[PDB]
Design a protein around this nucleic acid. Structure first.
Ligand SMILES: [Ca+2]
Ligand SMILES: [Ca+2]
Ligand SMILES: [Ca+2]
Ligand SMILES: [Ca+2]
Ligand SMILES: [K+]
Ligand SMILES: [K+]
Ligand SMILES: [K+]
Ligand code: NA
Ligand code: NA
Ligand code: NA
Length: 272
DNA sequence: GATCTATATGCCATCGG
DNA sequence: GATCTATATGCCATCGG
DNA sequence: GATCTATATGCCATCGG
């Protein structure tokens, strides 16, 4: 039997329809129930977002500032629609709590809770299914951990990493995100390096820690000059994007007692 | 040329009497 | 009782994939 | 969130005594 971990705020956008004024709490819960059955999940854990990541803010005060800018620019009509949506989503979460173990921890990204759950209890299940449209959750893929995106309708598996992310494995994926940064979170990368040049450098030199150890790289191309100046950026970005390595620290950033209680609660759920 | 940077979509109810 | 005086918090990253 | 629009790189001598 399997474990299913839901990126719950992320999933809620499947219910955002400007031409529907109706509540969706019931359909939200039902969708999760049907996904759990589809994926033979004996355990389902629903995660939700609750404020910006304290762990990441500490390293980067402009973290997700781009998201604030996006919402700031809304028209009066858009704001009204969004407020209705987000109130309906809050109601969907409340209903969810009565049915599934559902976690929100202020100042902790759902990404980090998911990474930690997989590390703590993933071994107790045949397969782990991650319900998220967020490609960064593919930092967690293994032969036993896969992802489903409602947006693309695709299942993401470790063996298809190159098709999906232009890298061959998770370690290269994490390195690539550190070099490239993450536009969605307002984390700048090395200017001039995208997936193609990033993959080439990784293939040649290894992971980001290996690359740092070899700087300066040769070449007078601007993007290499930029890479050569980016040791501190790369170390920082690695902390921000290497979900499996830093998930425990990210949770502990809002209190060690909180981490200890979450650990306890997750272990207990896996026995229920 | 590919590749990268940067922007804007009021996105989104998979799929089966 | 309420009301006022006086003090101490190493406060504080709203909120949305 | 993915996806799309739009921009800027003075790019570029693969690889083997
Ligand atoms: Ca997230
Ligand atoms: Ca189906
Ligand atoms: Ca607001
Ligand atoms: Ca050849
Ligand atoms: K970049
Ligand atoms: K007074
Ligand atoms: K087009
Ligand atoms: Na560009
Ligand atoms: Na006081
Ligand atoms: Na666009």
């Amino acid at each position: 039997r399997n474990l299913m971990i839901v990126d719950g705020t992320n999933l809620g956008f499947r219910f955002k329809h400007n031409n529907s004024k109706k509540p969706f709490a019931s359909s939200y819960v039902s969708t999760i129930q049907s996904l759990a059955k589809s994926y033979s999940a004996r355990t389902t854990i629903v995660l939700g977002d609750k404020g910006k990541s304290v762990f990441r803010l500490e390293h980067l005060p402009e973290y997700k500032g781009n998201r604030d800018e996006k919402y700031a620019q809304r028209t009066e009509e858009e704001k009204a629609l969004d407020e209705q949506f987000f109130e309906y989503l809050k109601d969907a979460f409340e209903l969810c709590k009565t049915t599934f173990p559902t976690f929100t921890i202020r100042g902790v990204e759902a990404d980090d809770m998911a990474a930690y759950i997989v590390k703590l209890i993933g071994h107790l299940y045949d397969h782990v299914w991650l319900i998220s449209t967020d490609g960064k959750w593919d930092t967690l893929l293994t032969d036993k951990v896969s992802r489903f995106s409602f947006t693309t309708r695709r299942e993401y598996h470790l063996r298809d990493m190159y098709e999906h992310h232009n890298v061959d494995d998770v370690e290269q994926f994490i390195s690539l995100k550190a070099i490239m940064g993450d536009l969605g979170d307002n984390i700048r990368g090395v200017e001039g390096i995208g997936a193609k040049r990033g993959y080439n450098i990784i293939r040649e030199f290894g992971n980001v820690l290996d690359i740092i150890d070899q700087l300066p790289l040769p070449g007078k191309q601007k993007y290499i000059q930029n890479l050569n100046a980016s040791e501190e950026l790369l170390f920082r970005n690695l902390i921000l994007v290497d979900l499996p390595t830093y998930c425990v620290d990210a949770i502990a950033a809002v209190g060690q007692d909180v981490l200890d209680k979450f650990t306890k609660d997750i272990l207990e759920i896996a026995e229920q």
